Amino acid sequence: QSELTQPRSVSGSPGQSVTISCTGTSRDVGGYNYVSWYQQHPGKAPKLIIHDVIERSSGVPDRFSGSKSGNTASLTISGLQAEDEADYYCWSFAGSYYVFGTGTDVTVLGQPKANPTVTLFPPSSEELQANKATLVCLISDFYPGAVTVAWKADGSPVKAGVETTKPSKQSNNKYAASSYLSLTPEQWKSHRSYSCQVTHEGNTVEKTVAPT
């Protein structure tokens, strides 16, 4: 039917303003004054923040405003706060259907360096009796959201059987990832120690488990 084009992402620093544009056709954003904006945090339903181009929903501060000029609607957010970090979608009536825009991921920067907390578990008893063995390296509360994971057996690296998630953002826009090493019960028993060595911003943190 057609698309309502937004920038994929925009970032700002705390206390600044960002504007998000939304370009449609004379049939939608230019085809009525029925433009809404939606805010959506990870895992929650969208919240309606602006309706009828310019009107804030109840409880939405005046830090949020909408506008329009020909076929392009805009949302401006001023005094940007950590909590404004989210995806935003415009929306318009389009005569015989409705359409959401393509979405803009808004990141709010600043926010301090956090180094990860690393927690490493060795295989459990129940797992070994099951003839499987999983080493779990949990990495949390880091910022920025990038880490490198290296595994070790005695000295010497291991590279076979590793699966690591992408960093995702926990409640607080501080990041968490996970890494798994699958071993056979008899390779777990062949070494004296296994290590999870996590790098973030030049700095490596290490944890270590052992058959014991």
């Binding site: 009828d52 959401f100 459990s124 129940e126 949390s140 996970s178």
Partner: protein
């Protein structure tokens, strides 16, 4: 107060069918116009079908025309979406959303129901206890948890001591393996000094497979 309560999602084969429902309350359902909106993993919102306050009169995204039917009954305040001949690209969270004055926008939203369209079958999780080490228990604090291995689809729910334990709890996002199965871990950090008197049970729930496992986590 003003809520929309949805049900019906699921794992379905390609070609399969599913009916979603959405029971309303807190507002005059029959005077609001109602939509289904969906969102695929990692992707954007997309409007799907609309029905006007009366019924009968309906609009469909072209993506789903001929396959979906939005309906309602204002006597039982319920909204439906019949989805037929489902394909993998229909895999999404589905939301019912309502709109009293038309063109105003949608400001009542359901919590969403996950629809998975796959040729892969449901696999229930294996739950393994991640025992507090007898090392850093020289120090004040201990990490304990549960390994939730080899399930499909998305998602698994984890709570602790039937939901009474909430402080110190971090459930991590799942790893998608080569095999196409998920695993995740939940961790609780607790006072070491509690590890003798206090019982820590992780309650794992995975709907698709009707799996509810309680696993006691003990020192090793």
């Amino acid at each position: 107060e003003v809520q929309l309560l949805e049900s019906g999602g699921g794992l379905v084969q390609p070609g399969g069918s599913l009916r979603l429902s959405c029971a309303a309350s807190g507002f005059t359902f029959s005077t609001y116009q109602m939509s289904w909106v969906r969102q695929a993993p990692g992707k954007g919102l997309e409007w799907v079908s609309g029905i006007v306050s009366s019924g009968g009169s309906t609009a469909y995204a072209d993506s789903v025309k001929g396959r979906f039917t939005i309906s309602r009954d204002n006597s039982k305040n319920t909204l439906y979406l019949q989805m037929n001949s489902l394909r993998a690209e229909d895999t999404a969270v589905y939301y019912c959303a309502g709109e009293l004055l038309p063109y105003y926008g949608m400001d009542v939203w359901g919590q969403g129901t996950t629809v998975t369209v796959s040729s892969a079958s449901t696999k229930g999780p294996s739950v393994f206890p991640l025992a507090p080490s007898s090392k850093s228990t020289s120090g004040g604090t201990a990490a304990l948890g549960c390994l939730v291995k080899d399930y499909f689809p998305e998602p698994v729910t984890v709570s602790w001591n039937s939901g009474a334990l909430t402080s110190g709890v971090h459930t991590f996002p799942a790893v998608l393996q080569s095999s196409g199965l998920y695993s995740l871990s939940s961790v609780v950090t607790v006072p070491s000094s509690s590890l003798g008197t206090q019982t820590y049970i992780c309650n794992v729930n995975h709907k698709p497979s009707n799996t509810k496992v309680d696993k006691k986590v003990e020192p090793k």
